């Protein structure tokens, strides 16, 4: 539904381009992305360094969906690349709170090929809150 | 244009066998919302040093990432300088195994390490 | 005899293409010196129920582990009963990947999360 | 009697500030079924050791697991001996940081690299 529109941002932010919002609900963010030239290797492919972008953005993201306000600041994050998205191609970035202490948030995201439904790459992102 | 834009204002100062040192300021264009170096990029660099790092052995295959981590311990500011030290921990055949520290260039510390597993060929 | 013992009364509840549901009461035996679930029998029953969802394939091959993450959100206490749940993401050719998730048996509330790469062959 | 029972055979080589070393020679006790370090007692040993590290700060604190990776690059054959090495890489005010190498004591090889946070109080 919601157009984002990261491209006119200043900041590191800015490499997601436009991504479009389909649903925000309480501690899940669903996204999704077309891959552009912008997003990609030389190769052609999602570029490992903005599938972590993804990972980091979309979690935040989940965590701001959150009874508490709170982004937090990243203490340790993991992401597993299992099959390759191409340029051209639409991507769907689905970000889970695992959880939500007082001091730390634990967060999952996966990313799949929206046309086949297999996961592209699985993030967890720990991040420290206050 | 694509992607790798992104590393565009790197320099490498140093890259020998399985070891690779880049050095970079933090400027707006890496920052996040609240003005540190961007998780995001942190993990680029992981990824393009590391890679680096195994270009710069014998068999200089790049690999396709499989796995990789990140230890965030420390923020880096807008205007700090960085050094993104990578080390090629093994090469298998199939598998090499890489790890990468972001130091703060005037205090020494460490800002984040990563290790970043890649499958070769 | 050899380290899997540690592993004895763990119940398999189903095997089932791509999933693994074991179960377990925690014991003293399985505990640290604070009485919750020690973080390395955690490791290794991700280690083990996720070889075991990998098994559960016509190419029932174990694979030797690469890279596995474990994320710890809640103790698991003496006397608890928890659920173990493997679920195979992706089996290639050459990599295998693996969830796991321990769940209170009652409340259904994560205890941990682990991701456990393998190389096949 | 509770699971740290598996680290009977470990001995401590020296425990020095930031930086711990064990040893031990893997017998079957610690192997899995091919006959090698068990993935499952190797996190074992990264989570205790690290935690040795930690204790030995003026901040005597042990803290609890909170994200825990491993990466295994070699085997551990039986009746070899290894050693364990922890480094803290940060202590923090709530958050500890800490890194664990195993390898091969006659070549200095590595089996595994760990990094383990650990939450304060």
């Known amino acids: 539904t919601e157009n984002l529109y990261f491209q006119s941002m200043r900041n590191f932010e800015r490499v997601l381009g436009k991504?479009?919002?389909?649903?925000?609900?309480?501690?899940?963010?669903?996204?999704?992305?077309?891959?552009?030239?912008?997003?990609?290797?030389?190769?052609?492919?999602?570029?490992?360094?903005?599938?972590?972008?993804?990972?980091?953005?979309?979690?935040?993201?989940?965590?701001?969906?959150?009874?508490?306000?709170?982004?937090?600041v990243s203490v340790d994050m993991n992401i597993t690349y299992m099959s390759p998205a191409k340029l051209?191609?639409?991507?769907?970035?689905?970000?889970?709170?695992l959880k939500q202490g007082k001091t730390l948030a634990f967060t999952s995201v996966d990313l799949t090929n929206k046309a086949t439904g297999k996961l592209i790459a699985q993030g967890r992102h720990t991040?420290?809150?206050?």
């Open 19 to 72: 991504i479009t919002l389909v649903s925000a609900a309480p501690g899940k963010v669903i996204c999704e992305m077309k891959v552009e030239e912008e997003h990609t290797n030389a190769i052609g492919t999602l570029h490992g360094g903005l599938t972590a972008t993804l990972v980091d953005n979309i979690s935040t993201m989940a965590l701001l969906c959150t009874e508490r306000g709170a982004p937090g």
């Open 88 to 97: 051209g191609e639409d991507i769907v970035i689905t970000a889970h709170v």
């Open 127 to 130: 991040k420290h809150l206050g």
